[PDB]
Ligand binder design. Sequence first.
Ligand code: HEM
Ligand SMILES: [Cl-]
Ligand SMILES: [Cl-]
Ligand SMILES: [Mg+2]
Ligand SMILES: [Mg+2]
Ligand SMILES: [Mg+2]
Length: 363
Amino acid sequence: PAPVAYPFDGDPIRVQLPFGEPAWLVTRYDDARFVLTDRRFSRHLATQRDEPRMTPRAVPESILTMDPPDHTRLRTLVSKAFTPRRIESKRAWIGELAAGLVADMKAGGAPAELVGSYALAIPVTVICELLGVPEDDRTRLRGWCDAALSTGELTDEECVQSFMDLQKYFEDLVKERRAEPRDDLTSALIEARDAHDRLAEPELIGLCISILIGGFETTASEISSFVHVLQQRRELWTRLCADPEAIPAAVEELLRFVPFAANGISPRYALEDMTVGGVLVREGEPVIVDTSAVNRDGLVFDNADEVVIDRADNRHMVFGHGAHHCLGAHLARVELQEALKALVEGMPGLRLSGAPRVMHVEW
Ligand code: HEM
Ligand SMILES: [Cl-]
Ligand SMILES: [Cl-]
Ligand SMILES: [Mg+2]
Ligand SMILES: [Mg+2]
Ligand SMILES: [Mg+2]
């Protein structure tokens, strides 16, 4: 087919992202399950092909560009450190943090700018605390944080200097924690072993960066979009004010419902010619799962285009599937649950004044 421009039956669609080669776009859940689970699809060809992507720089090698067995080694090592216990043990604290940020907005008076004061504030502080970045070094991360969230108007060179600054900073942090270990994720990653296997210094630095960048904008955008969606369907906001125990269910359903601009899921490359949902995918061609479409696939989700908080069997793909399923999924869930909880408890009368980049709120 002639490719169509992406971002903008059920058969895969030929698309052209802003950069890279043309790709097949998968919109059906059943098709996506194959693409993301099966060992006949590869990520590591990313770095030998011209990867469909939103930004011009060729993609750096990372945990997200690996295939089993190299990938499995990395995930095994990371799972020794990034454990569900280490995550849950932070829930109360994340809750206190969230409550404190709501109280800070209150003390400043309406209107507050929710993106900057809340949606961005929670994940950057949570990730930093987890990683062990001290408060008096967090200024080093601000450049990236601006680069991730903006258009206005960082230079090409400021972006690359701010990303290299992440490398430089995390190199220092990894050296410091190797020499003086602490109770943080960075030290636990350095200490992780699987027999004699361990993460090399460049792998540690890369993982710290992958954690920060995987957790920051994603979590931030979802907090902002959750609040937007709940405010436009205010009957749902009110329900959560009346029934804060429904928040975990509501987080799952908002994760399903909130549409991604681009592909949150990275391209997978066919290792041999295969038909997927009726189209021939050639050896070496990329296939992109559209998270938003798959999460609205009416063959799987009844009333897919409505928000149904208590939806039974809400097995969405917002965190992907298969081997590369979001390392941070549990942490993200904790952050989103506690973010919504603090807002509905602290500001049940919240309304919009004028994901979003800026979003002003009164109460
Ligand atoms: C709402 C928040 C989040 C969303 C929607 C999200 C989404 C995703 C998705 C879709 C993937 C798979 C990409 C693919 O297979 O191509 C992924 C992977 C990843 N996520 Fe997240 N994520 C979120 C939060 C986090 C957090 C808080 C962290 C870290 C603490 C994190 C770290 C990562 C990492 C390291 C990977 C790569 C895993 C691998 O390749 O094995 N994410 N995430
Ligand atoms: Cl042929
Ligand atoms: Cl999941
Ligand atoms: Mg299979
Ligand atoms: Mg140094
Ligand atoms: Mg109850």
